[PDB]
Scaffold this active site. Sequence first.
Site, PDB file in Angstrom:
ATOM      1  N   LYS A  54       5.414  -4.680  12.387  1.00  0.00           N
ATOM      2  CA  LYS A  54       4.593  -5.544  11.550  1.00  0.00           C
ATOM      3  C   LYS A  54       4.150  -6.749  12.375  1.00  0.00           C
ATOM      4  CE  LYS A  54       5.128  -3.517   7.440  1.00  0.00           C
ATOM      5  NZ  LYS A  54       3.998  -2.939   6.658  1.00  0.00           N
ATOM      6  N   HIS A  88      -0.960   7.711   4.466  1.00  0.00           N
ATOM      7  CA  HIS A  88      -0.078   6.579   4.203  1.00  0.00           C
ATOM      8  C   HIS A  88       0.758   6.693   2.932  1.00  0.00           C
ATOM      9  CE1 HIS A  88       0.799   2.378   2.825  1.00  0.00           C
ATOM     10  NE2 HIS A  88       1.201   2.280   4.079  1.00  0.00           N
TER      11      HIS A  88
END
Lengths: 363, 363, 363, 363, 363
Positions: free
Chosen positions: E162, E293
């Site tokens: 991230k 996803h």
Amino acid sequence: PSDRITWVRISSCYLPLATPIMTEIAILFAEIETAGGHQGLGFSYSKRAGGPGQFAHAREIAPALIGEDPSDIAKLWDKLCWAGASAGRSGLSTQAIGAFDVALWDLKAKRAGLSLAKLLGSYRDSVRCYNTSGGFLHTPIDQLMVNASASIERGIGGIKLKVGQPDGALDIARVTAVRKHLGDAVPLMVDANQQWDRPTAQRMCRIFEPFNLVWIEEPLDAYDHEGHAALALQFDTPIATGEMLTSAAEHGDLIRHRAADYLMPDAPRVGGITPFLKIASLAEHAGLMLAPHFAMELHVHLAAAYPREPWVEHFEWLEPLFNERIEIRDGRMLVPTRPGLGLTLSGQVKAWTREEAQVGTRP
Amino acid sequence: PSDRITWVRISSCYLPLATPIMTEIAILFAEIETAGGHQGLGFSYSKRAGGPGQFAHAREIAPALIGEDPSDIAKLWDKLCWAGASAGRSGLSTQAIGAFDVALWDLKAKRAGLSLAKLLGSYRDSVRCYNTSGGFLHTPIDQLMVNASASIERGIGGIKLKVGQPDGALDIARVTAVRKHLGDAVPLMVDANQQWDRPTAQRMCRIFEPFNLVWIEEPLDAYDHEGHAALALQFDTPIATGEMLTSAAEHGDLIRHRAADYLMPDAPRVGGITPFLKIASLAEHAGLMLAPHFAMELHVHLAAAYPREPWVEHFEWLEPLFNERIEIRDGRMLVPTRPGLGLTLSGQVKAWTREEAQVGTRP
Amino acid sequence: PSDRITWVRISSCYLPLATPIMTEIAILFAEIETAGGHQGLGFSYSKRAGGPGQFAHAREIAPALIGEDPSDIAKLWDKLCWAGASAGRSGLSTQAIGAFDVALWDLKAKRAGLSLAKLLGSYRDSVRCYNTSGGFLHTPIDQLMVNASASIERGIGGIKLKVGQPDGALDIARVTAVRKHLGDAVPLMVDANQQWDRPTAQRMCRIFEPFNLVWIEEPLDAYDHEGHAALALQFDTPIATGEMLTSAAEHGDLIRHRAADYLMPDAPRVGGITPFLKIASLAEHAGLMLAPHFAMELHVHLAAAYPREPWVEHFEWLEPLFNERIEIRDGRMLVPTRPGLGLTLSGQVKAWTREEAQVGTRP
Amino acid sequence: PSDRITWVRISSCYLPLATPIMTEIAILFAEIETAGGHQGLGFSYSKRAGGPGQFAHAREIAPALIGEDPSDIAKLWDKLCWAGASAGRSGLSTQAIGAFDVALWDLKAKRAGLSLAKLLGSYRDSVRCYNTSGGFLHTPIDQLMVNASASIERGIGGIKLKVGQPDGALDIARVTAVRKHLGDAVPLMVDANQQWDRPTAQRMCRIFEPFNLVWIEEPLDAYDHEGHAALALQFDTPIATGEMLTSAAEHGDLIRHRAADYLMPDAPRVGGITPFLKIASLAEHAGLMLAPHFAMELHVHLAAAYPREPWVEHFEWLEPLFNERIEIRDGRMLVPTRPGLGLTLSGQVKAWTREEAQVGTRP
Amino acid sequence: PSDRITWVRISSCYLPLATPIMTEIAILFAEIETAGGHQGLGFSYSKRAGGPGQFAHAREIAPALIGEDPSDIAKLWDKLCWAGASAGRSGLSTQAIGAFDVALWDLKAKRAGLSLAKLLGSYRDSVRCYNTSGGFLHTPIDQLMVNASASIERGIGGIKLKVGQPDGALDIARVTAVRKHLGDAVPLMVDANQQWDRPTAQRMCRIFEPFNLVWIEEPLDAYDHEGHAALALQFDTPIATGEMLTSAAEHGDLIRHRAADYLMPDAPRVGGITPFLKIASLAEHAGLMLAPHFAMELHVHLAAAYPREPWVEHFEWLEPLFNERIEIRDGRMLVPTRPGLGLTLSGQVKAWTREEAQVGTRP
Ligand SMILES: [Ca+2]
Ligand SMILES: [Ca+2]
Ligand SMILES: [Ca+2]
Ligand SMILES: [Ca+2]
Ligand SMILES: [Ca+2]
């Protein structure tokens, strides 16, 4: 109608500059009052030739506003434009219209007891700001370095350096000097003022890439859209342009070319808030960033209404004209909370007024 | 330098119209004289609001011409534009510049002892012409019919009829009436003056197709380029537009859209002969036809220089301002043979001048 | 008419070169005189095959000029082109027309008592210049280095180096050597003379990038527009091409492809000043730079009339043909101030004339 | 902040239809009140499935409005959208957001003592209107004929006829019958409701051409943009579409294809006034006409703010929900002059409310 | 029909997260059973607001499935969409439809005794996988480094980090730290979660280039297609986006812009397997890579059916909802071999169910 315009006063005020750049700026003020007792103040301007023309046209079309509903701003912009149709949709005539346009927006905002930013609807209560710290190409780096440091100390969020002199090695040196002084953490941008030809711009942008500048402003002629588009496609550094344009159509052309990462519309210069909003709508849709040029007193409100984080220049030259002031804090300019534009004419405006006219009966 | 400008005089002359349509036209005259004893006369104009603004700007920038070489016309156009850069490249400021620009061209032509048409180089010694025969939407059909027939007997080469009234059936009737009266051998064109919306223009053009009109002028808003291009692609009848535009850039956009079969640039309105020539070059390359609007005294020369057969409107309103006249015969207006524009101010101009200024020392 | 052509004389003059390159150049001279006593001189040329063809065609169409108004230059260019319509709009026939075209422009300029630059209107009184300093691929770097230094000493503003030999490492070495000798402050450009294929050009342009050359000339075949466009898009270094083209149409195609940063039109080669102006208009609109090729005696005037700072090559091979000379100072070539092209045939032209013809009666 | 939201109430009201066509419409009402005593009312709706989903989502995100400045309308639209980001920017979630959005606009308008039309700025005080006169495909021709004639006598400005049944000959007959009854002076439009495939639409549009209909609505699937664009390019008759779209992005795609002469955005369906204004800006720039669909109580205000003459459908279904009414005369519906939307909930709403929730403390 | 639906049960299950990210995820389960005794299970979800809306809509349209042939999956997707036409083709309504859609696919696969992957037809029996190793921006690099190492040890094929925090230098440091720890042989990717503006994204992508990351995910706003396209054109590192989109149309727009090297469609989010397949077909034709996803339980099957080697994220948050588990080995996730999706609801689902409804008679 929601109300009706009964009085209009236009003034051509010549603002003397503390330091030659350009020794003065012609400001066209427009005051509008209605039968309902509402009032608005707006303005346009001319750097160099243009003041007399804007005033003369404003005086000629002002009567067309009497009796009209002030809330129908766009409609009236169109009516005044038609009143001088052979003059076109850009330039001196629409800039004169812009003074009236800003006044009508100021009046509508006040009618709602809201700042202009809140009437339009804002996204932030403060805007990123930057300044030149009184720096010009002729300013010894030593002085510019200490001045920029002071600006940062008092809250400025970035520094714009003037470049575009025949000796490119000079600019690179000056910029290198400023960057080393302030540090990598201080946002830095440059303005070439249309001084480079395509080949030179190409070479200078290449050199500046490692600098990670916020943007490179006006590297080419304001009208060389293909040129600007080519630079933006090639380099990582954002290209900023548009400050010289005078209409929504010109900005539309610039946008069609994808000629700018940061669009720099000038509300007074393009015809007021009405055309500025149309331009902002086009920039928003194209996914661009906004960096309005000049008149922070007006643009801080317009910038606050833009979806993406904009940049507004902290420029103090117009302050003597008004009784109000903009405050800066932690790199940001606070959006005024007072009704409308939040501006009233200082007592100094009278002494600098060279022409004036009014029509209608004041309430 | 080849020469040097030493004196400049600008006059704002209000031409009263014998027939209201608007009761007057503001004309900006520019007179230029050099140390070498050369002289030039040029002009720009404003229909409705604009006269005061043009004069005021012209007066403010006039000093920039003193001392300059009058032969570097384009260079000086740029210098005056830069002198008022915040005013843009179109509208009132460039129209003011155009008055000077025309005068410089007039002066250069005279320097060579050639008419403006011959200085530029001509393709013809006479140009197809047409007129409205004093007809407007309110002119009773039968009157316009005898007026048109009269214009034809005097040598006019075509008739332009005004249309665009809410009752389309009326226009169709009036045009049908005119066509039956004059005959199929008399060229006919119509002018809708931006009165139709896309849907209406679509239906009216459809109906007019059988008429074989020379063109349908301004069927839509002057700035609806996509709209005009769509009409031109669909219909056989040529679409004419451009008379409202005020810059080379706007004409370029129109040309990019292929929005006009007949481009109608207005020299004074776009900034003079210099920008007009740039527009003509673009139109020439795009393979378009030319039909300059207004000011026949100037456009007859410019039209003579266009490669393809143009059309010029023969209309009498400006005659009182000059001592010279245009001659028409066998459907064409003769290109004047005298040096330069072939115009000198009449004694009536003085009486109609409301503003004037001068700079420099007259030779 | 403004006047009328009464006599025309064409001469095919073979200019011997002091040093083989190519041992001579065929020059076609055209002389035009009118009933009014005006005269003009112009010329075209052929490097290698072409001289005989140009003369033969010129002789055949010359009669078409007699009786015509010399001021209608474009009209006459078209008439001569139509006179040989099956020959097309480019190549030998239009080059022959070009000799006459240049003469007519010379005549019109003289008629106004202005240099060609002033008739067209100039932007500068001197033009950036550069030379090869008599350097060829076979010139030992040592000599080229001392020759280039001398050129700079006498006022030349830049040096163009010949490259494009099988051994690329050689060119890089030679260029590196010249750059180290003259210093980074001396503008440098290279000419590959269409010697590279796309892959090689790609690799060489990459290598030259750090050199910051003014431009890389003719890296590919003159007709590989997509190839040139790809190079210009990829590299910072400007790409220059167009010197081989022979018509406005070919240049238009090159411009449409955005194949050149510096367009290098050759007036004599494309058909004269008339087509050259159309090309310059297209380049101007596309925002390109101009670097006319060959014949500085004519191009210095044309370059002076271009909006953006152009470059003209200082080339002395044609000097023996004329009585006049171009002067250079501080890196710039001075634009002649004499009327018209400012050229008259030297007494040496007669001895080198192999063919000649004339028609009409001399005034 | 300018103010602060302290209370919010949402209600799911099921409007029974006096005439099944679907026997009811689910209306989502949103009420917003602030610490400053300001209030706003807005709504969204669902024809067929959707009511429960809109309410449920509105209830879940409502708390996000408490404490926020109601003047930052666009900002809050984004905040609520982000609060349900996995739900996307269109459909049920944004329609729920739209109920709040409309209420915020209503509140801001009221704050200024202006109707919504005047807050936005209007171009007209009345808007062209049309109706179906309660006609459907199953309505016997003669009945629809007397109903239509009745609507015309009451002031309706046009008639929209439902078409799109398997037997095209029937529609053509019905439309022919209506046209002969009302006359050529009564504007007529047809709605095919996405019933035609490309081939059928092609043939039907061809047949309708002579009819001179105002428009042909939804001839194809709402998402067949290429199909609609092809019809618009081919036929004179305007193509109208967009009523089924639920986001600014979808309208943008339609506009990119030039798939509609008349764009028909539905404010409640696309997410409220905020996204509707973005769509209107795109349509304005593209030079299109506007004909908002459904909810005249809201669209009359939005239509009044569009630059070009729009059309709004006058249909009575929602009247029972409000205490106010729209007035029609001389073919146009009057734009309400009361503050904001000019709507208050009738006593009948309570009885039709099946779900409701509230958050915060009412002032 | 091949069979007929007789019973449908929908449940809104709130999955609590072991660690706040977001403290829970709303899961919509749909169960379908037929007269023939066939059964299917499917689901959709909402991160943050959306759960209540999806359930409410699902409950309202569920009755439309009763009596229908379960094999006509696309037909039924369309029928349910039409049942809520005013809700659009994306967002909450189609996500509700998606739960039913997945169930129908599960049922058809089971009918054939094949896994979903085999029903569609697979290209591989295992799929490349990667994970975050429980890493967030607030996770001390030290811990993230040891966690990533463990993941690799247990078979994970890559690590997604991230990024996108105000301090870019931080991300670069963290990524540099992870790369040095795991080694150059471990695939690495980053996710900026739409945190960068164009200028910042431009600078960060430049910095990451040497890292040779598998991809840079969501560098810009999910809807800035031109922005993403520009990044993909400029950088070698693949750009991945699309996870936020909710319809085939939005993905189509992204693909039209060539805005993604790796398309990341989310089946539940776009409306189920039916629209996902249409999207996969468009991506396949455009030559793109696929990286579905979320919901690996469903995407492992869909990924297995894609022509080019895809990447699927190993995500364990949903495991408690099912009795089955996915196994990973040597950097790859094994495609389940059980019939249909291979999922059954755990006993824990009941305790987390806050809403439920059913219609029809269970077989
Ligand atoms: Ca860039
Ligand atoms: Ca046509
Ligand atoms: Ca380049
Ligand atoms: Ca059409
Ligand atoms: Ca790439």
